[PDB]
Amino acid sequence: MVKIRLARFGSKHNPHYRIVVTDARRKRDGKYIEKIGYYDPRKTTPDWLKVDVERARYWLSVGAQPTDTARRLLRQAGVFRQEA
Amino acid sequence: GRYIGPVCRLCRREGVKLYLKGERCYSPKCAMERRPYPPGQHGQKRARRPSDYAVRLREKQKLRRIYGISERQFRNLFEEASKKKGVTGSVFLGLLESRLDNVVYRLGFAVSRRQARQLVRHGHITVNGRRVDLPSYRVRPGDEIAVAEKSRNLELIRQNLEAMKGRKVGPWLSLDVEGMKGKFLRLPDREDLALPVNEQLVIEFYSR
Amino acid sequence: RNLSALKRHRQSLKRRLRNKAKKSAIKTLSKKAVQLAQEGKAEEALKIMRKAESLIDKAAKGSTLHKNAAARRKSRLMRKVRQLLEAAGAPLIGGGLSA
Amino acid sequence: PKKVLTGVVVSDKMQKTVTVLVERQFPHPLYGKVIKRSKKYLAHDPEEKYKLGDVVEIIESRPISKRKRFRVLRLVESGRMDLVEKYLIRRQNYQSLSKR
């Protein structure tokens, strides 16, 4: 199965995650498929909100799953939201 | 670590003096005037034929001596000159002087380069806001480099203020005697602010 | 010292028991089929065929001759059965057999 | 994009199986000039519709057998010989190199 999740690429104490689709079985800091996000839980510069709205929506459609703080960042990205 | 010691012993080593120790190394001697010519035993024997490369090398030394730094970082940033495009050595001299210590110098804040390094490193000099340490901190076209809150309350600060007046700024270093500040501007060159070292020689020697 | 791969071991042993026994059953039934077939009488070989194919998708049912090999051996069985039938025999009794 | 090769059929030697003498051009990723080299693939001819020399077009196929890959499809031109002829001569001259 496939999962969407957070992969760090920051310095020895400079965290910074990317939100990306990968078939779970792949390792943390490894290859993926669709570069569909990034986000920094430290709020470096006001750009810490990145999710590929379209194909993330369509990804959760095709039968994919997210992670924890991924649910968080999508309940902020609103890709979850239908607007109501 | 900036040699430290017999400094204007190089004021004579290069041959011609430089604004080095400040008031004195500009007063009736940078150790010059009195007797300018390289020290040592062979002090004045009968100057030989400096191989062409060595004229070049002595120029490199010369320039990095006036600029007050070891040639390590100097090397790295000369490479940064090669990379950051422009007629290499020119925009090199520029992106050399853009360094905060001597920005503080020619801005008329510090009397001498060493003194400058002290002042800046102790955050006596602030840069567009935060009291930036690091003598090696290049600024940008627009930034206003000031001093510290406890500097208007500092001494040889007011010395510098009063005794400097009647001296015009490096045409981009827009100071303040009114508030002790100073805007950064355009990139100066060989002629905006000149000095006694032929740049082409320096670059040609360096990258060999 | 210990683990849960002792549990995995013993389990694997039971699963192997059922697997082995059933697969063997399939093999023998098939052999019966060819016996009465190269003979030349459909009848009992039709009974054998029913039993066989059922056990075949009993193999597909779980972790034995999964999907193909089950079906593949259905094919090959009925095939090798059928050919020898019309050879000295009237292919009758519509069982696991079309026409 | 099932790769297909245009080549001179060599030796009907086997039944339902033909050897095919392909030859490709190439540059020289160091010296510029062009080069050329022959490759013998496994033409699948289940009814000997091919024979001595006749160039046919061969196909990237299901693994027909042991190295026996590369079926056929469209026959091209017959009455070739001459080519297969020269190749043959070269073969005999391979058996013209001995240290024994």
Place this chain on the structure above:
RNA sequence: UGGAGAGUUUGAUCCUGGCUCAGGGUGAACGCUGGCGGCGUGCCUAAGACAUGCAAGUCGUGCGGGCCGCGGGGUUUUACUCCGUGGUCAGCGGCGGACGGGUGAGUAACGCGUGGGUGACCUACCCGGAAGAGGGGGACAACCCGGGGAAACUCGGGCUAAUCCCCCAUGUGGACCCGCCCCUUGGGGUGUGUCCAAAGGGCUUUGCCCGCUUCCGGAUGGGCCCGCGUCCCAUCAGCUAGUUGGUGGGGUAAUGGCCCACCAAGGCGACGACGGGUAGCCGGUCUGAGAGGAUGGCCGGCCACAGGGGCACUGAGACACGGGCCCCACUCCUACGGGAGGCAGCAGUUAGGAAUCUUCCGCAAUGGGCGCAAGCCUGACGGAGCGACGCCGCUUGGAGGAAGAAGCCCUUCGGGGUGUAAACUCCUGAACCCGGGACGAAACCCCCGAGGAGGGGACUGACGGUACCGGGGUAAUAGCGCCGGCCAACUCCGUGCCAGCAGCCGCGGUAAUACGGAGGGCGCGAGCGUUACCCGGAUUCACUGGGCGUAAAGGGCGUGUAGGCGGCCUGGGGCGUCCCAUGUGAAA
């Protein structure tokens, strides 16, 4: 937007031509010196051995239990049975243990890189959609009795369970066979005859949830194959009997001789087979004018392996690091009857070696396991530690201060040099106390709305009272190499082919700018040099970029096989060749 050379064979010159150096680079190591910090990186040799510690579990929304315990339910009570019920531990049971992780031994291979084929295939774990959950019945644990063993733990009869094992039914659909239909390598619809299903839990309980059975589709992964690219020895020239091919079967998920039967003799090679030597390939990295040369730690992709070799079972997935069996080798345990272990997982130990780390902290983040969740495991991972080990940042002070002290070296004894250097004068404030002080974390969870989309409510820090901010405040480690040409830096003693130096030329045979020492200078600066190792220079394997009259070098001449390479007109073809449009060339 990037490219320089000099030393060196002669009495002397030009050309030729090797040895040398200037250079950048390193997981380095060695002697000399060595302060704070960031980020990094740190067994390259023994794929030798490894003691200890940890590293794979989890679920009671799968099912019967022994044992600590409470109401003590029955006991009119007893002695203690037993409805309920908080907690431990095994079992059957279900998913994980085929991910994660370490290593370069093998492997010159379709392994890898790479572009595709699969009308030849496999794919549990989450989304789509249709079809669905009739009944009966069986086995073995745990546990009951008895025994043997040092331990490893072991045998026999006896017990009840279930999403555990089954048989008939229910059959959209699926599978086979035989037949038609379009397709055209087994693609797809379809007719007759047989076979295949299903398992129940939890409650807020009459309705929802978690799991279910069947097929079609999605998602991703993966096997199979193919074109091309992928190192030296031709003093390795012939290689071969499953070998080459078929037809017919086994086996596989399927293709294929991978395997068997049988039958036909091909299969391959100087375009460099077969064989020996050597190495995991790579995105790239360092060098380089460029082409090229080397190489592949860390990081990422793909391989293959667990002390060496063979094997199979389980399972959607493996010949399975920390699962089993076997053989050999090896240590290790015991009362000697007989046994256990595999750290090329994390630390650490040991030998090898000139060389390379704490038997540490946190599950607070991310990612993985399983669970309705609560939750637990998590040496993946997140961090502190030790090494100047590399890049970078920084400090050992800043201002005036002498026709210039003292000391020390040179002298033609007038002085010159170290030297603004010093002491002092003031200014600051490395270090270091007092105080305050973090970001790194909003979800899952609780309620409003239904558990749906949306709102509020609430727990969550290892790092560390560290980064950081405020006040206060002390002048406070500087060394290494060079100084004959290359090459910036010279005088003085001692030494007298002795002592020595040395990268090449050479330097010492009693006036040495080379040896030691001393003054002074060059360079570099928490660095300095040495050796090693690769690329450069080296246009010294020359493709941009070379040569063979006498310098290295034209075959003793012919002959002609293959190959290479070809005059001039026309048009067709469009193969190389150029262009046009996209897929791809992941990230870094």
